[PDB]
Amino acid sequence: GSTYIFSKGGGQITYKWPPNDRPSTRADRLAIGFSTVQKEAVLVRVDSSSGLGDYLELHIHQGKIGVKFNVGTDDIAIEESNAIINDGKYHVVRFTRSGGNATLQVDSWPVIERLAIARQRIPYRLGRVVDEWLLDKGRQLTIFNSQATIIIGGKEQGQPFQGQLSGLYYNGLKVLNMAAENDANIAIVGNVRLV
Numbered sequence: 001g002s003t004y005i006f007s008k009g010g011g012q013i014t015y016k017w018p019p020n021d022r023p024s025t026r027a028d029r030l031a032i033g034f035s036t037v038q039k040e041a042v043l044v045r046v047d048s049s050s051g052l053g054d055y056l057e058l059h060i061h062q063g064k065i066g067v068k069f070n071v072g073t074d075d076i077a078i079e080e081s082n083a084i085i086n087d088g089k090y091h092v093v094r095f096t097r098s099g100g101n102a103t104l105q106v107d108s109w110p111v112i113e114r115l116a117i118a119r120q121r122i123p124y125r126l127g128r129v130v131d132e133w134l135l136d137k138g139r140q141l142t143i144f145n146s147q148a149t150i151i152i153g154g155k156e157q158g159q160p161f162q163g164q165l166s167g168l169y170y171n172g173l174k175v176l177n178m179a180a181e182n183d184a185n186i187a188i189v190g191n192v193r194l195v
């Protein structure tokens with residue numbers, strides 16, 4: 001609903017949990033709509049408190065949307081490698097995590113149906129789901145500990161997002177809506193504006 005345009009030079013929307021409600025979770029739900037033409041960008045990153053490795057990162061690499069996270073132990077990647085999503089068009093991404101398991105869903109509305117065939121078409125929903133499962137007898141770690149910041153825009157990774165982000169949802173937090181409503185725990189910097 002609340003859409004922010006990240007213009008030339010990039011920008012950043014930061015949400016800081018009250019230093020005293022910093023959550024630790026077994027499961028996560030993230031949703032965001034986006035449009036971009038970028039080959040590479042970081043869209044959203046949830047980092048833990050200083051001194052901890054835990055993080056969750058939504059990014060685009062080689063035109064493809066994916067999420068990388070760490071919850072103690074190994075870095076875990078889930079990527080949707082069939083859709084090229086950097087076409088300046090709208091897409092919705094949905095990510096869930098349960099311990100080391102993870103699901104990623106990417107919806108798109110292509111207007112083309114393919115010796116491929118350039119057939120202009122009525123746009124239709126094309127959904128892709130990827131599930132990643134780990135099979136140890138509950139052996140690796142499962143908790144994203146002490147979540148401190150949700151940073152939207154990718155500047156801190158040296159990979160700024162340019163284009164449109166909307167409708168961010170994270171564990172009950174409608175972060176871009178809270179930004180729009182001038183939430184005390186949100187800071188906006190750079191070339192970012194509310195549509």
Ligand SMILES: *[C@@H]1O[C@H](CO[C@@H]2O[C@H](CO)[C@@H](O)[C@H](O)[C@@H]2O)[C@@H](O[C@@H]2O[C@H](CO)[C@@H](O)[C@H](O)[C@H]2NC(C)=O)[C@H](O)[C@H]1NC(C)=O
Nearest residue numbers: 026097098099100101102131132133134135136137138142
């Ligand atoms: C992460 O996932 C494992 C495995 O999940 C199960 O295995 C298949 C993998 O494709 C999946 O399709 C099924 O939905 C199924 O849930 C979970 O561990 C398994 O589930 C139960 C406990 O709910 C155990 O009794 C099983 O023995 C165990 N299977 C194996 C092979 O280890 C695990 O709980 C889950 N992690 C979290 C935190 O949700």
